[PDB]
């Protein structure tokens, strides 16, 4: 199942395939098959983000 994580930092997408998010927001992890870049989903849409920008503690 897709798991939820919370953002530790702001991240603003630079490429079209990246997700934008803000500190404290929830992200759904859709695909963590890659170690450093995960596909997620939030209220803004979907896209890739750095795995080290989030935590499993909600």
């Amino acid at each position: 199942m897709a798991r939820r994580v919370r953002a530790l930092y702001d991240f603003e997408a630079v490429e079209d395939n990246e997700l934008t998010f803000k500190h404290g927001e929830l992200i759904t992890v859709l695909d963590d098959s890659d170690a450093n870049w995960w596909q997620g989903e939030n209220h803004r849409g979907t896209g890739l983000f750095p795995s080290n920008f989030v935590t499993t503690d909600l």
């Binding site: 930092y9 630079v14 490429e15 395939n17 450093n36 870049w37 750095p50 080290n52 920008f53």
Partner: peptide, 9 residues
């Protein structure tokens, strides 16, 4: 903020 590296996406 942690450093980001896009070379490896």
């Amino acid at each position: 903020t942690p450093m980001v590296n896009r070379e490896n996406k």
